[PDB]
Design a protein around this nucleic acid. Structure first.
Ligand code: K
Ligand code: K
Ligand code: MG
Ligand code: MG
Ligand code: MG
Ligand code: MG
Ligand code: MG
Ligand code: MG
Ligand code: MG
Ligand code: MG
Ligand code: MG
Ligand code: MG
Ligand code: MG
Ligand code: MG
Ligand code: MG
Ligand code: MG
Ligand code: MG
Ligand code: MG
Ligand code: MG
Ligand code: MG
Ligand code: MG
Ligand code: MG
Ligand code: MG
Ligand code: MG
Ligand code: MG
Ligand code: MG
Lengths: 203, 99, 148, 51, 193
RNA sequence: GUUCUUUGUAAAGUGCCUUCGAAGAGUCGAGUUGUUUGGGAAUGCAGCUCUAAGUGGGUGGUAAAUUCCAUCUAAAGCUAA
RNA sequence: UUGACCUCAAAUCAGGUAGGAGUACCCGCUGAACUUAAGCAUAUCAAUAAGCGGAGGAAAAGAAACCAACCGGGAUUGCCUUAGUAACGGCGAGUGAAGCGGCAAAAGCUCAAAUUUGAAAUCUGGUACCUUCGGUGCCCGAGUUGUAAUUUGGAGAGGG
């Protein structure tokens, strides 16, 4: 089908055609609201890859997020502590701009569940994302056993809890020696390692 | 590659009767795939070169493969990726006018 | 238990055994290993020479299972044989039908040669052997068969 | 000619040219939709035709 | 606080460690609950032994490669050689591990043998039949114990050929040590102008 | 356990030959900055710049070039104890 | 002039949904200092308190881009160990995991990328009736910028 061609073409971002489309579309998105409903996916192949289906109940939202570091919000840059914490201007917000995008979109459409999101564009000021959401109340989603898992209350605001792809990435949820700190949850692992286990018959 | 049966040395380890398991279909994740070869060729035809690819072609034609590989290693991450990209670029050059 | 402790005996004695002049203050010398180089230097250099500094080369991601190699000296070499079979193997010290000892199965990696064994042939299967251990086994008429 | 995300059809003229398939860029996904009983179609092909 | 001749201690209690102290007062209660859960699961499931048949498998890491133990599941090759399909083995109580591969004929043969033994020693009930009560046994592991393979016999003839096993080990280590140097030396001496 | 339902020349599994075998991109990776980690020429995370490939890609706890080998298959997803 | 389409609106339109509480435990963000170092700035306290967002009966994790280097193991979690060890550290004070091994519990899987193309085979809603956690007929609508069936790498697909 056309999705293979779409996927290969989308990887030529610095080609002439994609540069032209980038400029025109970034202007249009900038003119629109910071968060706004998208009529259809701009990248249908990417939406399908991320789990979107073209049926009633699936929603696409475009969201603009400011780029750069997280300036420390302290007044006048005063941190009132030791010089190791005096930094204000090169602090990095250990969570993705994509995660910020999905959290804001989910707060907007709280009746939906954030399934996923993907990058669509960026300028110096903004990064642009399209968020795929599912309507857990829609009967097309409550039936269709492939998708009614997201109807379970355990999946409320998975983007707010870091359960989407970008959330698991930022939480460091991966297998292996490089994720010893964050495999089963960073704080849970820390608690387990800093718990004193005392048995009835002391060992 | 048969083990020597002793605990030290080059092919150390216990001798067992080998089996040669059937090849997994994984280990072919990055395979040839005529379909994707066609799609990638068509996309390379319709979308041309990136600015750094054009710069690399100019560097190959004017300053040599070594300078081109230096610039490619700068632009991409690694030296292996740079070498592969320069090979692709001079294959493009060969497929171009200078057949 | 509390009823046997000296704090029961210090009841009625004001300083609780801690002195009138130098009391029981909180942390008079610092906490933990404080001042190991400055005011506890004598107690460090005596009773703990070698404590400060670095002494060798690092080993990132060292796994102890690589170095697992428990040692068994020739002095025993026969506790590995079950006690009942040991007598009939010690008697009739024959070149044929010599007892086979799988020291790796017993849980050892290298055979060392501390003791002395009787003049009884034994087939000692091991991953590694000391030179003297092998010569003593051969002098007793046995053999070392390297395994992995 | 009016496929709003155009990447869905930009490769189509070149694909048809490479496969030797005659192609025409025509006005109206809405018109093609009327062809195929849909609102929009974005493509419309003839593979066999009556004699 | 460095007093008289005592070992240096490393007691890590400089955090709020008292906020995370797990005293296992519930050891006995949890044992009771585990036994209750095993009994309820045994009653709930079919007269099925509470656990799947596991393969015999060699432990890694030469510290442990001398011994054999239960693995996760039988390989696809082992199941095929035992004459089942993976899905049906999973339904009749055989653990199947697609990840494990067979490079050892002895382990493969032992696993195929215990699969055949299990198939001969279990009775599969018909889907819509009678299958009179078959006296559930609770442990497939206890029914099919993992046995350490016998590597040698108790007594044998001494066959010392004068090879000097210590010298064999020394030579193997030295040859490994100098293999690359000798290969480079031969590469450079193959110049032949 | 017992009965009216019988699905259905429907669905599924298995042998041999043959042609194939699509497998996720501003992502991986790289530099730099900050933070973090036991992770030490850099453990994870994040910002910015660069930005892949397909016998590829990741990992293989000392940076690098070269030659191999081993082991998985990312950038999408669900799941009880 | 009529009828579409696309995009964007409005309605006390038809039907729904979110917010707040609780918050012991759980998933994240943000984030100290007292304190220890006999001073102190890195460090430590602590990836903690406080602050903010978000769940459930558990949560999270989870069926390997794993561990390994073996005669190889084989999702995740937890316990016992590894181990106060490798390593980090004004290499000072201090800090500090992981593989293997025993055990508890065990469970496996599904999408995207495929032409149904001799038949959008898919689905919401409305309405009538019915044996009403739903079913059937009809009607709109969604949907080809792709909804079903089929496949998920362990494979698997097309032909014979
Ligand atoms: K502060
Ligand atoms: K005193
Ligand atoms: Mg819609
Ligand atoms: Mg900012
Ligand atoms: Mg007195
Ligand atoms: Mg006093
Ligand atoms: Mg005094
Ligand atoms: Mg993938
Ligand atoms: Mg922080
Ligand atoms: Mg995954
Ligand atoms: Mg999950
Ligand atoms: Mg209304
Ligand atoms: Mg709330
Ligand atoms: Mg305090
Ligand atoms: Mg101090
Ligand atoms: Mg003080
Ligand atoms: Mg002070
Ligand atoms: Mg708090
Ligand atoms: Mg509740
Ligand atoms: Mg539970
Ligand atoms: Mg869960
Ligand atoms: Mg898999
Ligand atoms: Mg495991
Ligand atoms: Mg110890
Ligand atoms: Mg710490
Ligand atoms: Mg099938």
């Amino acid at each position: 089908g056309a999705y293979k061609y779409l996927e290969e073409l989308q990887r030529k971002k610095q080609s002439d055609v994609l540069r032209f489309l980038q400029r025109v579309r970034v202007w249009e998105y900038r003119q629109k609201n910071v968060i706004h409903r998208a009529a259809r996916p701009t990248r249908p192949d990417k939406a399908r890859r991320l789990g979107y289906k073209a049926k009633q109940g699936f929603v696409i939202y475009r969201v603009r997020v400011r780029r750069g570091n997280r300036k420390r919000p302290v007044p006048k840059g005063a941190t009132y502590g030791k010089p190791t914490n005096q930094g204000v201007n090169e602090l990095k917000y250990q969570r993705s701009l994509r995660a910020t995008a999905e959290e804001r979109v989910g707060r907007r459409a709280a009746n939906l569940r954030v399934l996923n999101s993907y990058w669509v564009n960026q300028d110096s000021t903004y990064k642009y994302f399209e968020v795929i959401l599912v309507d857990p109340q829609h009967k097309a989603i409550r039936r269709d056993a492939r998708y009614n898992w997201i109807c379970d209350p355990v999946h409320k605001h998975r983007e707010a809890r870091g359960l989407t792809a970008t959330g698991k990435k930022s939480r460091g949820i991966n297998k292996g020696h490089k994720f010893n700190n964050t495999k089963a949850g960073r704080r849970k692992t820390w608690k387990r390692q800093n718990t004193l286990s005392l048995w009835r018959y002391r060992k | 590659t048969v083990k020597t049966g002793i605990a030290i040395g080059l092919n150390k380890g216990k001798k067992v009767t080998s089996m040669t398991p059937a090849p997994k279909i994984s280990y072919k994740k990055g395979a040839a795939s005529n379909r994707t070869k066609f799609v990638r060729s068509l996309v390379r035809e319709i979308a041309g070169l990136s600015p750094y690819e054009r710069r690399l072609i100019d560097l190959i034609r004017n300053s040599g493969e070594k300078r081109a590989r230096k610039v490619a290693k700068k632009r991409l991450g690694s030296f292996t990726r740079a070498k592969a990209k320069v090979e692709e670029m001079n294959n493009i050059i060969a497929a171009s006018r200078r057949h | 238990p509390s009823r046997f402790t000296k704090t029961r005996k210090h009841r009625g004695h004001v300083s609780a055994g801690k002195g009138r002049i130098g009391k029981h203050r909180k942390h008079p010398g610092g906490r933990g290993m404080a001042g190991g180089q400055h005011h506890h230097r004598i107690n460090m250099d005596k009773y703990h020479p070698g404590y400060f500094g670095k002494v060798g080369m690092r080993y990132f991601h060292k796994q102890q299972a690589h170095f697992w190699k428990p040692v068994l000296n020739l002095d025993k070499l026969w506790t590995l044989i079950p006690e009942d079979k040991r007598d009939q193997y010690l008697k009739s010290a024959s070149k044929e039908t010599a007892p086979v000892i799988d020291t790796l199965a017993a849980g050892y990696g290298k055979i060392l040669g501390k003791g002395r064994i009787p003049n009884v042939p034994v087939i000692v299967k091991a991953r590694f052997v000391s030179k003297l251990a092998e010569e003593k086994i051969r002098a007793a008429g046995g053999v070392v068969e390297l395994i992995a | 000619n009016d496929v709003d995300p155009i990447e869905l059809v930009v490769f189509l003229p070149a694909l048809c040219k490479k496969m030797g398939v005659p192609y025409a860029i025509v006005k109206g996904k809405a018109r093609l939709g009327t062809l195929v009983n849909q609102k929009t179609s974005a493509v419309a092909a003839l593979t066999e035709v009556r004699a | 606080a460095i007093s008289k001749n005592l070992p240096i201690l490393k007691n890590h209690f400089r955090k709020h460690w008292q906020e995370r102290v797990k005293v296992h007062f519930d050891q006995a209660g949890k044992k009771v609950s585990r036994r209750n859960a095993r009994a309820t699961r045994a009653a709930k499931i079919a007269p099925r032994p509470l656990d799947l048949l596991r393969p015999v498998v060699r432990a890694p890491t030469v510290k442990y490669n001398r011994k054999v133990r239960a693995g996760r599941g039988f390989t696809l090759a082992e199941v095929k050689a035992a004459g089942l399909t993976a899905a049906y083995a999973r339904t009749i109580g055989i653990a199947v591990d697609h990840r494990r591969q067979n490079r050892n004929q002895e382990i493969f043969d032992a696993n195929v043998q215990r699969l055949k033994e299990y198939q001969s020693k279990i009775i599969v009930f018909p889907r819509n039949g009678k299958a009179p009560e078959a006296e559930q046994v609770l442990s497939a592991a206890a029914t099919f114990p993992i046995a350490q393979p016998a590597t040698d016999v108790e007594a044998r003839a001494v066959q010392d050929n004068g090879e000097s096993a210590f010298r064999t080990l020394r030579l193997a280590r030295s040859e490994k040590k100098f293999r690359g140097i000798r290969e480079k030396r031969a590469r450079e001496k193959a110049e032949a102008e």
